[PDB]
């Protein structure tokens, strides 16, 4: 015999206290009432399609219930009808993502929602930090993220400057105290505290959000024909 799900509540494992707490508080269901997961929470648990459509058992949390919802509305739904229905439900789906999901909408501010190009370089960074960084550890969950951020600031300075000069970021390690690494710049080019982004500084941000060999982003930057990928990728460790 073997025991997969009987273990994840143990102490030696890395799951977080509250995660163990929920996976405990969820009551199971016998085999007789097993396959009801395709429709409802059966004891606090459900099945969900993957990006490959294949199903997956998962606890019935607000975020994975939202996943379920989008799976019967959005990805079930094909290519062409996808972009426009997103254009429509935008105001709603992002409110959700920011309320009841783990990879939120990037383009939000003090709860105020918006899109990328409505967001300033300064807000961009103050949110990149807010997510890719940990005030508790005062560290970075990873470095492809910190690397991301530095490579962003680099062309920030490329943009607002006039002629060549030396990066205020010569090593991304300077980010290990971020909130200063920004003012060190947004005092060099205060214009960005006000200006929105050039889109040439959006396509970049995104081509980077799609960087192989890097850890995907803990948020959503955009809605496009790739929402599912940005939505249900590397969506396991967070617990």
């Amino acid at each position: 015999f073997l025991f997969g799900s009987r273990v994840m509540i143990a102490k030696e494992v890395k799951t977080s206290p509250d995660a163990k707490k929920c996976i405990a508080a969820c009551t199971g269901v016998p085999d007789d009432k097993w396959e009801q997961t395709y429709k409802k929470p059966t004891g606090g648990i459900v099945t969900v399609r993957s990006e490959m459509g294949e199903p997956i058992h998962k606890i019935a949390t607000r975020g994975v219930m939202l996943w379920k919802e989008f799976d019967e509305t959005i990805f079930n739904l094909p290519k062409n009808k996808l972009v426009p229905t997103l254009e429509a439900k935008r105001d709603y789906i992002i409110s959700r993502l920011n309320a009841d999901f783990q990879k939120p909408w990037f383009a939000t501010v003090n709860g105020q929602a918006r899109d990328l190009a409505t967001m300033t370089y300064e807000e961009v960074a103050k949110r990149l930090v807010e997510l890719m960084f940990i005030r508790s550890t005062n560290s970075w969950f990873d470095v492809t993220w910190r690397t991301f951020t530095g490579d962003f600031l680099r062309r920030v300075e490329e943009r607002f400057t006039k002629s060549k000069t030396l990066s205020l970021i010569q090593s991304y390690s300077l980010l290990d105290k971020p909130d200063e690494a920004i003012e060190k710049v947004f005092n060099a080019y205060p214009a960005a505290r006000e200006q929105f982004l050039n889109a040439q500084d959006i396509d970049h941000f995104l081509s980077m959000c799609q960087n192989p060999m890097q850890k995907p982003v803990p948020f959503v930057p955009v809605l496009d024909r790739r929402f599912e990928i940005f939505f249900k990728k590397d969506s396991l460790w967070q617990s």
Binding site: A117, T118, E194, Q195, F196, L197, N198, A199, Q200
Partner: protein
């Protein structure tokens, strides 16, 4: 055809003195937004 012509011009800032503060700084913000939204368009379009 002799249809000559003479237009002239003044500096805007000789205008805002015709009005009240609260209305000016109210106008002000309502513009800044524009410049940005305009900045955006100009570039989204300039590219594509």
């Amino acid at each position: 055809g002799q249809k000559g012509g003479q237009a002239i011009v003044v500096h805007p800032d000789y205008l805002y003195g015709a009005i009240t503060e609260d209305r000016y700084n109210e106008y002000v913000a309502k513009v800044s937004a524009r410049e940005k939204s305009a900045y955006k368009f100009f570039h989204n379009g300039m590219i594509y």
